[PDB]
Every structure is written in C-alpha cells, then in structure tokens.
Design a binder for this molecule. Structure first.
Ligand SMILES: Nc1nc2ccc(F)cc2s1
Length: 126
C-alpha cells in the first residue's frame, strides 16, 4: 500500500539521519576521507528518498487523498530546502571551507528537525 511505501521511505530517511550523524562526528574529528565517503553515501540516499516521496505524492494524487497531497506538497517543498542546503555543504567540503560546512550542517539539522511533525502527520493521513 501507499502506507507501507511511506514506511519504506521513512526508513531510508532514518538511514540518512544515521549516516549524517556519523559524518558530523568524522567532520569534527578531521577525518576528511571518511567525510567524503559519507557524503557520497548521503547523496545516493537522498536521491532515493526524494524519488520514493515523489511516487507517494503522485499516488496520493491519483487516489484523490486531498489531505495527504497537501501535507506531502508541503513536505516535499521542505525536503528541497534540505537538499539545497546539503548540496551547499558538499560544495563547501570540496572548497575546503569548514566555516561554511559547519553552518550548512547546523541549518540542515534544523530544517530536518522542523519537518518531523509533518513527517508523522503524513503517516497518519495516507
Ligand atoms: N531534512 C533533510 N535533509 C536533506 C538533505 C538532502 C536532501 F536532498 C533532502 C533533505 S531533507
């Protein structure tokens, strides 16, 4: 069902949270080789999550589930805020700008924490 598809999407999201926290530790410790690998792993994970979310939103639209579509439209918009901040983090890493990397990382954390009550509301609406 769309609901089990959202549970699968949510797990992929939690995998990115786990890898992100590991990456943040590696950044603080200065292990740039690890950070590079974790950033590649996060890119693939966000690419997967985004696509799953899109399929869920498209299915909610085909089902006529207006509330779930509203919530998912908002949530995907927020996801793209996170995506832009993540990409800016990756560029800061490439450029060696640790000040910007720290900034973007904290902003990604706050964007993620904010969009959590919505994430739960979607599970209930689908
Ligand atoms: N809370 C979030 N972080 C990211 C990071 C990258 C991305 F593409 C989407 C999101 S949503």
């Amino acid at each position: 069902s769309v609901k089990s598809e959202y549970a699968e999407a949510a797990a992929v999201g939690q995998e990115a949270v786990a890898v992100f926290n590991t990456m943040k530790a590696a950044f603080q410790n200065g292990d740039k080789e690890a950070v590079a690998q974790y950033l590649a792993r996060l890119a693939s994970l966000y690419t997967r999550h985004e696509e799953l979310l899109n399929r869920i939103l498209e299915k909610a639209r085909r089902e006529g589930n207006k509330e779930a579509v509203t919530l998912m439209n908002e949530f995907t918009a927020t996801f793209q805020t996170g995506k832009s901040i993540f990409n800016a983090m990756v560029a800061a890493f490439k450029n060696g700008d640790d000040d910007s990397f720290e900034s973007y990382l904290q902003a990604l954390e706050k964007v993620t924490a904010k969009g959590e009550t919505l994430a739960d509301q979607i599970a209930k609406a689908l």
